[PDB]
């Protein structure tokens, strides 16, 4: 059995881009197949168990979709933790504004679960990835500039470290910026090694 195909089981353009770039030396074929599930149905308090339940639910949906259009499938789920609050994608500009403003002069975590499955098998491997990003102080003006670009709406906690203004206020990251953005290749490399 020679596996040459990766099923990219996410709608994230960034994730798809990194996967093709980093894993094109191993895989010939990259198939886009987003899970498109109702994530609101899953509600665990622990963000590690939360993201894991969602990544596994996403994998189930992807493998089902694969049956009707040898391979490995990958899914992901990621949330932000700020203080005691678990944050997903913001529901409005107002909440996003609030989210971004709160990152000034402090630390913010991301918690994720990556899942991997060889299509046709029953074992779904999972791995967690956690980051912590530390910002210097910034004011309402920088908040509005980031908001105006709109990409923040599509990230957990409205956290966009790649944003022109946000980037200028990052002091350090424990982890990698690719991890904060939702796809650290080292995590996928570790899961592949566990086959
Ligand atoms: Mn765990
Ligand atoms: Mn999610
Ligand atoms: Mn999603």
**Torsion angle defined by CA atoms of residues 157, 162, 166 and 170, in that order, rounded to the nearest 10 degrees:** 100
Residue 1 Cα, ligand 2 centroid: separation in angstroms?
33
Q: Which CATH number do you get for residue 13?
A: 3.90.950.10
Contact 22, 14 (CB under 8 A): no
Q: Is 186 helix (H, G, I), strand (E, B) or coil?
A: helix
Residue 114 Cα, ligand 2 centroid: separation in angstroms?
12
Containing structural domain, residue 154: 1-195
**How far is Cα 114 from Cα 94, in angstroms, rounded to an integer?**
30
Residue 163 Cα, ligand 1 centroid: separation in angstroms?
30
Contact 56, 37 (CB under 8 A): no
Residue 106 Cα, ligand 3 centroid: separation in angstroms?
26
Residue 189: closest CA among 129, 130, 132, 131: 129
In the PDB record, what is the listed experimental method?
X-ray
For residue 42, give the ligand nearest its CA.
2
Resolution value (Å, 1 decimal): 2.0
**How far is Cα 166 from Cα 143, in angstroms, rounded to an integer?**
9
Residue 1 Cα, ligand 3 centroid: separation in angstroms?
32
Bridge partners for 110 per DSSP: 80, 131
Residue 128: closest CA among 90, 179, 82: 179
Displacement of CA 137 from its chain's centroid (Å): 25
Degrees to nearest 5, angle at CA 92 with 163 and 169: 25
For residue 10, give the ligand nearest its CA.
3
The conformation of residue 159, written as its DSSP 8-state character, comes to -
Total number of domains constituting the chain: 1
Contact 103, 159 (CB under 8 A): yes
- Terminal Cα distance for the chain, rounded: 13
Contact 75, 16 (CB under 8 A): no
């Amino acid at each position: 059995e020679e596996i040459r195909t990766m099923i990219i089981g996410t709608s994230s353009a960034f994730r798809a881009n990194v996967l093709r770039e980093h894993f094109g030396d191993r895989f010939r074929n990259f198939v886009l197949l987003p899970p498109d599930i109702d994530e609101k149905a899953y509600r665990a308090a622990d963000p590690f168990e939360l993201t894991e339940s969602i990544a596994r639910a996403k994998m189930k949906a992807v493998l089902e979709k694969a049956r009707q259009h040898p391979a490995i499938a990958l899914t992901f789920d990621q949330v932000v933790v700020k203080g005691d609050e678990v944050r997903e994608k913001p529901l409005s500009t107002e909440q996003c504004r609030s989210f971004i403003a709160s990152y000034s002069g402090g630390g913010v975590r991301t918690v994720a679960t990556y899942a991997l499955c060889v299509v046709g098998t029953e074992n779904v491997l999972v791995a967690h990835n956690e980051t912590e990003t530390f910002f210097s102080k910034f004011g309402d003006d920088i908040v509005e500039r980031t908001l105006e670009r709109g990409a923040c709406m599509n990230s957990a906690g409205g956290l966009v470290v790649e944003d022109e203004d946000m980037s200028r206020h990052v002091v350090r990251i424990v982890g990698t910026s690719y991890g904060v953005r939702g796809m650290e290749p080292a995590v996928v490399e570790k899961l592949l090694s566990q086959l």
